[PDB]
């Protein structure tokens, strides 16, 4: 499982763990909220630029 461990760690900034949901981390949250902002002008922009 080493190739997946390295890929997920780069993407999520945390090591994968058993008994955990494997969400995707901060990058997953930023991508999801960025998608909301693009679609509508009424959607909030909550992700910091930093």
């Amino acid at each position: 499982d080493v190739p997946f461990v390295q890929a997920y760690s780069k993407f999520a900034d945390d090591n994968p763990r058993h008994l955990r949901v494997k969400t995707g981390g901060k990058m997953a949250n930023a991508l999801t909220n960025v998608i909301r902002s693009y679609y509508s002008i009424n959607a909030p922009a909550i992700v910091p630029q930093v």
Binding site: D1, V2, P3, V5, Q6, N15
Partner: protein, 751 residues
Amino acid sequence: ELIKVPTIPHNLVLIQSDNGKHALIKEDLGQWPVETGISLVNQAGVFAVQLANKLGIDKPFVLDAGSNYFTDTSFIDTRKYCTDGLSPREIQKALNRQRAYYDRPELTISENKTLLSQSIIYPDADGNDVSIIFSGAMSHAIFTYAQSQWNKNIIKLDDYIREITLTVPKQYRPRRFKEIEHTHGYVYRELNQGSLLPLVDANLKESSSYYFKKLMSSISNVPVDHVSMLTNRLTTANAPTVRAITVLTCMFKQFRIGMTYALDPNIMDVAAATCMLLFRPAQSISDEQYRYCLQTMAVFLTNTTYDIVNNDTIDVLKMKLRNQGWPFVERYNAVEIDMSVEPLRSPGQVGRYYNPFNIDPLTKKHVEDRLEEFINQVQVGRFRNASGNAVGTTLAAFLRACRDKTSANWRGYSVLVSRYRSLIPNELFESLRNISGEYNINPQDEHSFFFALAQINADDEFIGAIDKESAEYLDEYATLARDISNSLTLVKAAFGPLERTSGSIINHANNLNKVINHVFADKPLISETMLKILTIDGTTGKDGYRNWLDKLVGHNYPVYVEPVVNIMNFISARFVADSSYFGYTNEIMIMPNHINVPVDDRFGFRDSPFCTSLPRTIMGNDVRRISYNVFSMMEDIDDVISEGFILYDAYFNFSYDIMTTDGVTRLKEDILIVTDTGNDIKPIHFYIYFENRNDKKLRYESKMNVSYRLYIKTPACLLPLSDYMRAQHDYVSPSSSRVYIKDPAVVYTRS
């Protein structure tokens, strides 16, 4: 100090047959023996440190690999060709030979250029240089994780200064860093502070005695510049000792001091008792000592006896003394002065210390506003006799001398208390207590101390000596905090709870001795500083550590997980998860030669002992599985082995060497040894040869000479040459513009 690693460890070897038909790439991380019947994770931790040492990631480091490149002769090509990892020329030669066997055209110029340009170094936006090289998967994963952990403690110099800006006083000259340090300066520091409470709470008497004695030795070196009975007893022999007690009472919270009076009190004892109550903090005087002082004054002034006032309460004693004409029956709280800077090892906290001699800093006088009126009362009082006023006049004159002395010398002692207070942290200020009464004041020494108070002289030698002590104290606290963390981790991993049974007690005692004997062998894990703290009572340092460790079992103290612990946990996890990388497996299969089992044909081995996965079913029926303990105890092993089985529930260590020639793949030794006690499996060593597919002699030898075969899961270190793109991995090296500062101190030592 940071270690600057020049090259990347790849651990890749290329093995090719003489014919050139088959080639493969292997990771060589070594062979690590694993013992069955005990915990695998405990053995993994021991091997984790050795693996970290082998890869060079045990100590803090950064990677300098951005200068390991060259440039091609073509004018179009401006790329950088990395020299790290497995050389692309070696892969080109291996591919080159493979095509020669198959009578295929050689690699073209365009195909050669693509392959030889696979290893490159390019810069990113942040200025770091990333190197793409051919390297093993396990080495890349461990190396990259170690980089992430160490880089957490590498911060900009301006970020470090902001963290420690509240601990810098105003008496030190600021340090001017160079312009390069301010823009490109970086420091490696650990910013987590460990509590000293676990050691202090467990051994309060020993910890208090150690620090109290150290402080007194430093303070005692400060430079300084009826009447007959009082005037015949003055002695300045122990004035340095009394001076240190005074500073200790003000620099600490609840440093109780005590005085013992004679069986028959005289005018000197009353003078000492009055001086104690008037010029010492109420926080340093207990209720019992307050009652004892009131009783001593009552015995002398009222001419009563100790038996009469032994059952008298505080309020009754005050009433008796006030009726006679004595108003000095009160103890006074000191006024707390806030430190100008945040104390050491106390982040986001405010330090404070009592002002000496109960002098209010706002009014610069005694806290008692009735002091002058009280002295007049004593002077016109009739004590111990019908008339004469000898006692009152003598005490009034003595009291006035003390009042002027304390008023003149309060500023000098306040400075001394403030400077020594900055040495101790806030936890030691609030926790240390005076137990066993190992410091006491003689009544003659007290009244001699205040009658002959000496001014405090702060020479340049004293200031320099204190600055040296500050550096020593900082190192001492840092060393103690590390050993507390090491002890807390050791107790949690190696000990459990106790039970009211003989077996549990015996088990705990034996384990405790085994741990203690291990941690004191070679270079001790525990520093000499805490061994001094635990030995201060006279016990052996080894015995003291054993006692402290037992007390710590079952603690709930939080321990911060440091980067080195994270690194070893990563290596330990991958040791258990990927066993084939390290030369051990948890399952082997023994089958007769006539049974055809599917094997791994990727590498072109002859009768490969490697299967992609041990088969669930053979010939339509599930393969039998026997544990090693049952197998060892079997007496009908001949009947069972005729059908073939799978052995598990053990950790099998195996080795192999791949021979480039062609021959009969076999084992060095026989599979099993049968004894009257039990059956065992001999050490496993595979001689693996590549196959020509058309040699009748070797086909006949393999089928008829060898009758039984041993199969294991295919090691993950092996990788066919065709899949060389799977070894392509990235490594990030920080920019070469950074400068690392060894001494990040922000001020100099000069007034």
